Amino acid sequence: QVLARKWRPQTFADVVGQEHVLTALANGLSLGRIHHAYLFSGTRGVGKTSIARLLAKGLNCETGITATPCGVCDNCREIEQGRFVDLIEIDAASRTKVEDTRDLLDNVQYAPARGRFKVYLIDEVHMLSRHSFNALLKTLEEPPEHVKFLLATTDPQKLPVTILSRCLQFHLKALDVEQIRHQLEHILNEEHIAHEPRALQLLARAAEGSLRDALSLTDQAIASGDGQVSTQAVSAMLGT
């Protein structure tokens, strides 16, 4: 049980920053105003896949479509561990799985098994092979009612305008140092873990906008200097 994992957002509410994206998805889920495809854009580390998964969670919670998924039903618990059957996770950026991808994209499992929606989460989507695009391109045109597409990319422009014009796009932003620092302090207090001021500042300046890496580092700092988050440990982990 490490901070990076233990502090994974369980609801839109737990997310730091991105006010506009959270409001649009929360309200959207709360209003039954749901689109066919969503496009999450931003630099690596802004939480693009983290927010898309919370969306899938909210979309499939057994209690119903909601912005505040219960987190205790099987869909929620499984979706949270990326072991859900209606949440097909794809990595277009890796050649290790190019085989199954192209397949799944035609093999659009048109009908959920246990969830009310079948969800495809495609990370680094602009990297899909000429093949996966075209089928994907074809589906966004004529979209199955119980199927949704959650796309993530660090490079929106590299996508055809035919996919761009068919997706509601969410522009995730990097956090300033204070938002990261404040969260870090709040986390360590809840955890009853000691921390020096400059130490958290070094950790936040270091994170470079990402709260996900802000946490890994803190963990890789709580590990170095044994016990607490002491300034020497931190600048020592930032090492040499």
Angle 211-222/197-207 helices, nearest 10 degrees? 130
CA atoms of 10 and 76, how far apart (whole Å): 9
Residue 73 binds Zn ion, judged by CB under 5 A: yes
47 is annotated as contributing to ligand binding: yes
- Taking CA atoms, 175 is separated from 153, 156, 193, in Å, by 18, 20, 23
Residue 210 CB, shortest distance to Zn ion, in Å, is: 27
Nearer to Zn ion, 84 or 133 (CB): 84
> Is 58 among the annotated ligand-binding positions?
no
Which of 173, 170, 95 lies closest to 127 in space, CA to CA? 95
Segment 5 to 64, residues that bind Zn ion, using CB under 5 A: 61
Assess 76 for contact with Zn ion (CB under 5 A).
Answer: yes
**Minimum gap (Å) between residue 78 Cβ and Zn ion:** 10
Residue number, 10 or 109, with CB nearest to Zn ion: 10
Q: Compute the distance between CA of residue 202 and CA of residue 231 in angstroms, rounded to an integer.
A: 8
Q: Is 167 annotated as a binding residue?
A: no
Stretch that binds Zn ion, among 66-74, 90-98, 122-130, 187-195 (CB under 5 A): 66-74
Tokens of 157: 């422009």
* Residue 66 annotated as lining a ligand binding site: no
- Residue 70 as a binder of Zn ion (CB under 5 A): the answer is yes
In this complex, which beta carbon is closest to Zn ion, that of residue 87 or of residue 92? 87
d(CA 53, CA 11): 10
Residue linked to tokens 């130490």: 199
Contact positions with Zn ion (CB under 5 A) in 176-205: none
State which amino acid sits at residue 211: L
Residue 65 near Zn ion by CB under 5 A? no
State the Cα–Cα distance between residues 33 and 195, nearest whole angstrom. 44
Q: Please report, in range form, the residues annotated as the binding site for ATP.
A: 42-49
Where does this chain bind Zn ion (CB under 5 A)? 61, 69-70, 73, 76
